Structures are given as structure tokens and as C-alpha cells.
């Protein structure tokens, strides 16, 4: 039986808190689970293996000479930009928008997270999952997401998103 505090937990969760858990917060350039240079809250800098390219992309993104290091405030600004880009990417896309529109608020967060992680064309290519989601076939959608390279190459970053598509609750983000 949910306590008063437990019923408040959903109001504390949103897309920013969700991606902050899945992506972490790092103030120095590091390589993600796929070996790509990343910083902040999941900001993929480049897919190039050249750190100099990553640092160049960073300085461009932040607007100063960072030498591979940013502040928390800078990470947060970049994060908000990246979240806005994922939302805009869904809403302008004729395949993703109707699916997103059909979803409840919590699954819409899972959808934005999914696009933040994979990009629009990657997600829009999941033909069967998108149909399943639109048809509210949640268990099937989650099983099919669990077959993807996105999840299987880096399970810890994707597992909670998959659970969230299955349940439409925030339970996978509780008790870190």
C-alpha cells in the first residue's frame, strides 16, 4: 500500500530526472558503454575515436575553451537542449508523432528517453515496437525492445526505459 510519500514520488519524476538516472552526470569527457566520447548527462560528443574531435565538439557546444571539463550548470544547460531536441525530433516526425500522442505521460517520457539515446531514425525503424505501443501491447513491446542492439550492447542504460514502456509507472527509478 503506497504511503503518502510514495504517492508523491511520481510528482518528483519527469524526463529530466529519468534521463539523469539512466545517463549519470559526468563533468569530464568519458567514453560511454559503446566507446563514444560523452560528457554531462549523456551528451554524445562525436562518434569519432579521436579525443581532439570530442574536445572540439565540446568547446563548440559550450562556447568556451573547456579542455574537456564543464560545470554542473553547463551540463544542465546542454542536457535541457538535448531533451528539447529529442522532443522536437519526435513531434516533427510523421511516424513517431502519432505513437507518442497515443501514449500516457509516463510512457511519453520513455519515448523521449528512447529518442535521446538512439536518435530519431533509429527509433522510427523499430516498426513492430511502434505498432505494439500504439496498440497498447505493452508486454510485447517490452520483449521486442529487449531484442534490440540498443538494449543488448548496453543493458544498464536501457533497462529502466524498457520496464517503463511495459508498466507506464516510475517503479524502475525507485530505490536506486
Swiss-Prot record:
pH-activity relationship: Optimum pH is 7.3.
Reactions the enzyme catalyzes: Hydrolysis of (1->4)-beta-linkages between N-acetylmuramic acid and N-acetyl-D-glucosamine residues in a peptidoglycan and between N-acetyl-D-glucosamine residues in chitodextrins
Top-level EC class: hydrolase
CC annotations in GO: host cell cytoplasm
Effect of residue 32 to E/Q: Loss of 99% of enzymatic activity
Pfam families for this protein: Phage_lysozyme
Effect on the protein of changing residue 23 to Q: Complete loss of activity
Binding site for substrate: 44, 116, 129, 144
An MF annotation (GO) of this entry: lysozyme activity
Effect in UniProt of substituting residue 42 to A: Almost complete loss of enzymatic activity
Induction context: Expressed late in the viral replication.
Protein's recorded name: Endolysin
Amino acid at each position: 500500500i503506497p504511503t503518502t510519500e510514495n504517492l508523491y514520488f511520481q510528482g518528483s519524476m519527469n524526463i529530466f530526472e529519468m534521463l539523469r538516472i539512466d545517463e549519470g552526470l559526468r563533468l569530464k569527457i568519458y567514453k560511454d558503454c559503446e566507446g563514444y566520447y560523452t560528457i554531462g548527462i549523456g551528451h554524445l560528443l562525436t562518434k569519432s575515436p579521436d579525443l581532439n574531435a570530442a574536445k572540439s565538439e565540446l568547446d563548440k557546444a559550450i562556447g568556451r575553451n573547456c579542455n574537456g571539463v564543464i560545470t554542473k550548470d553547463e551540463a544542465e544547460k546542454l542536457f535541457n537542449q538535448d531533451v528539447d531536441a529529442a522532443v522536437r525530433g519526435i513531434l516533427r516526425n510523421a511516424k513517431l508523432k502519432p505513437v507518442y500522442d497515443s501514449l500516457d505521460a509516463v510512457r511519453r517520457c520513455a519515448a523521449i528517453n528512447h529518442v535521446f539515446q538512439m536518435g530519431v531514425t533509429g527509433v522510427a525503424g523499430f516498426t513492430n515496437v511502434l505498432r505494439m505501443l500504439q496498440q497498447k501491447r505493452w508486454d510485447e513491446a517490452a520483449v521486442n525492445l529487449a531484442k534490440s542492439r540498443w538494449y543488448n550492447q548496453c543493458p544498464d542504460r536501457a533497462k529502466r526505459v524498457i520496464t517503463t514502456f511495459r508498466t507506464g509507472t516510475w517503479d524502475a527509478y525507485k530505490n536506486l
